[PDB]
Structure of 3C-like proteinase:
Amino acid sequence: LVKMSHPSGDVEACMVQVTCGSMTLNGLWLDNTVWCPRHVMCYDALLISMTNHSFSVQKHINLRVVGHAMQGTLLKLTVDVANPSTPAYTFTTVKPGAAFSVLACYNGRPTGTFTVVMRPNYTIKGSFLCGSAGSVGYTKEGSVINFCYMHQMELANGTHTGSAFDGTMYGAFMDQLTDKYCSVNVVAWLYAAILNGCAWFVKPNRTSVVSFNEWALANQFTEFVGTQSVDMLAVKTGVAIEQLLYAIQQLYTGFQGKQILGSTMLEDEFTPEDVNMQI
Amino acid sequence: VKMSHPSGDVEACMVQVTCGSMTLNGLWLDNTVWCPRHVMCPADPNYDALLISMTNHSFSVQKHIGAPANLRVVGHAMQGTLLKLTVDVANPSTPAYTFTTVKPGAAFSVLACYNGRPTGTFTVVMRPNYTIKGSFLCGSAGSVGYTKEGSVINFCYMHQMELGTHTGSAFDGTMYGAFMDKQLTDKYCSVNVVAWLYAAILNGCAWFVKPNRTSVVSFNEWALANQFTEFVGTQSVDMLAVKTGVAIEQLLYAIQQLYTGFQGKQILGSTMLEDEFTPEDVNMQI
């Protein structure tokens, strides 16, 4: 079990530096659009201020701005060349629990890639430094890249958030509720354990989904919704979901010893789809 | 967080290499395609023999990503556990590159491929027993590991086999830890826990740094019998030691008492030690 990101090449070819007056950060060049975070101008008063000569766009790794809009927390620039390296793409929101890949960029230059999970408090625990705004998070299905996160800000140490390409910011933060354990990913990780001969924590005892979801409201766990991915894990291991929901209720109380895939606490950052693909 | 280099560069150089009924990945730089030598093996073999049996067209090289399609093999040599295949088209997308061998504790990025197609990228550290903890399935041999200083790619790994651990070749042909294409006990990476501690100090968890200090030379001989690696300090560590004020010898003592166990305490809310982040990592991310 490894934190595994999509290869970053397709996205790499779309990362541009967008600049406006003093501030500069990362932009996403798709077709004739350049997406970027709007605080590049620091709002409706600020938009009237600018002209197309207020934005310069550079590709590092020759563009003129001939259009300007704002859409939510995002600037929708238009440019005179369609990116010849534009992947087949989509805009979509990620619901909490789900994982996506991040291309961390600075001054329009990609420098790192890693995977994060969209936390239940609508933040993400990645590694972002000053000027990484405009880095893009994405997943990939078949051949269609699917862009789901533009980076914008850092709330406290290590907690970051950002927007979907519809301009909406995750968790409505303007340019934090308590975190919870993603119950369905914990379930996946527990199945991953069983599939690697580490099954000391399984009992015949069971907790119904409804009982667990009530218990979850009281202990900062997410509502469990079963999926085909989880069901396939159930079949292969022989161990029912509800057994795992019981073991969670007990393991949270403490590991009393005793390890699971090298960890002393619960892991909620690997998804069912993650586990299936890797095991 | 575990953080791999962008892969677009390397993605441009991945090909599929076919020989008989066997297919895996190769790396395409200049006129040379490197691939693991067991692509020659039908379902203990004698590689020098099979390499003789190789005819002008026993090798086929497809490139799937970017602009297709097929490359003609023009000559074939063996080197170590790899094949050096020469092709008449030079890779236009070849970058500046070197062939470095990583040492244990060092971290490199892997690009996992299947039939020439990149499918995922992650980061491993090379284990003290010369294995890596990857995610690799059938047909992933040929997947390459690399680091990038400047815009220079340091290719350091070609994936060969599964032992649940993994190993492969340096690009000079030599398998890591001298495994054969037909496991000693792991140890804790002393310098990487030093680096991990330093990230704890830098983050507000500083309780373990008693003013007592164990020297390098003595921690080392201690390590030889408690499954730690010989500590070798580096300028990267020293930056992490000036920024905190805590001396290396302090944490070397702290490892000696923390190995016994955490006595009901948390560092980074970890009960065991983490040896999978490097001083370079800490320096970059904190």
